[PDB]
Amino acid sequence: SLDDQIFVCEKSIEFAKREKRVFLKHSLSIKLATLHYQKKQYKDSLALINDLLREFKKLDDKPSLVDVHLLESKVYHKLRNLAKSKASLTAARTAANSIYCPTQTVAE
Amino acid sequence: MSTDVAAAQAQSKIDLTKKKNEEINKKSLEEDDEFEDFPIDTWANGETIKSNAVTQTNIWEENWDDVEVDDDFTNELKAELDRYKRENQ
């Protein structure tokens, strides 16, 4: 079940920012957003994307958040608005001028 | 209002001091205003609400709900009535 997965992440992130470094926290926030997209509730997903974008724009250089911008294309694709998917698509591409970072990212 | 474009007759034909004597003398021949003969015997005219809904004190342009009454209730009912007819066609 979806709900099971959601809960596993929800427990982990609390235990991943108080006893362990910042790096771990935003790992579970990517995964949790993806799972609300499996749930097809998009408002939950936009909330975690908003936490990712504000807190780590002064730390943006990661392949992690190229994906976060791709996840907006998916969230906005399903809500059926393509104006703001094409935006976040460029956001991913410009930030993926680090193109010698992983192969999966490049396939998505 | 008045015939044709009211505003066009209003701008063309305006008071001068030459027309001023004429405009009074004409009025006197129509036996006063005959709009201050009116409110006396009615002891104050009311409003139209008999067939208007947005009445005549609108602060934007009047509709044609001033000659018609609320037709949404009739619509609701027709709908429901039509569903039994089709059900039992």
Partner: protein
Amino acid sequence: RVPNYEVSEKAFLLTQSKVSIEQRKEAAEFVLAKIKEEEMAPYYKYLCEEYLVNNGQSDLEHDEKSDSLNEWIKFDQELYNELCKKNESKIKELNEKIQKLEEDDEGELEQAQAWINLGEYYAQIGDKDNAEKTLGKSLSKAISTGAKIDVMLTIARLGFFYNDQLYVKEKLEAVNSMIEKGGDWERRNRYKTYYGIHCLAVRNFKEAAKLLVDSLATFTSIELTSYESIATYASVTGLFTLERTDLKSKVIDSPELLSLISTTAALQSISSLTISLYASDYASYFPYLLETYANVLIPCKYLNRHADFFVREMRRKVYAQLLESYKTLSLKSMASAFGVSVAFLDNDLGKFIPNKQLNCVIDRVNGIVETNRPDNKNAQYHLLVKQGDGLLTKLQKYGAAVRLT
């Protein structure tokens, strides 16, 4: 200044008796909690006056009839006592401060912000008049030009809050004269939102459709009713003004409407009517119309009086849309698709053909509805001749006075 738009809606629902009764007493619970908290008793005094013999007919300091179906409405003297304390303590602090900053130099800005603070508090409790007096004091004083503009719209909100449109037009007339003085694009977006709500009240929606979608495109919905309400409005006006060609384009396609989805009922009904017009399912259009009057038109304060007008026009749009497409239809086929019967069809067409929009006939004998809508040299001629008659009329009129003198 903030809670004004919210409270105004909930109170307006109370007045209505064409809505659910269930909705009213959820509204009543909420709206009164906030009247106690933010001391909105002036505004309460105003509201009961305006009801009157629809609502408030269950209050202690009024006469009690069976007009109100609510009873959670109850105006008492308890409210009044609270008013006296909270107003006395605040007003008095702000009065002593204004005169302090007369002593300080460059004090014009300092006094402006204090008289704004006073104009917020009078906005909070009701009083459009006392905010108006105090924010004109702010107006003279040196403040940034963008603040002057913001101030002027601050007073306009107050005319919405009270429920008198005629106050708002004078208060937006001042905005229209100040807009380019600041030249600000920041308050331009704010002006589209205010003036949009204003032109939603006007019979002409033409100005409103353009405004209310710019309000969707640029994310401005603030110090006024929510984004979801903004969208609802955009849809209604979209439908009324725009032809079937421009309708897909601008309403049914809008990134902003799709992204906001329909999460509220009001927004759901209106969008549903639009989708079914294009898709050409007319058997879902009629029920959807009834949803529209219930949950949008009648709960709004600017479509209250166009509630009947939109019901009618929409039945008119769709009939006429079909009569473009068809030179013959039968009463049966047409009636069945619309979800009315033939008798029911007759009467609805029997208003709309004398309103000069559908230009068709009805046979009862043969039972076919034929279409009598020209598009050819006859249509061209009717229209052109009228305008040239209109040139002749000005020419007689304008010539005659100059000669006469």
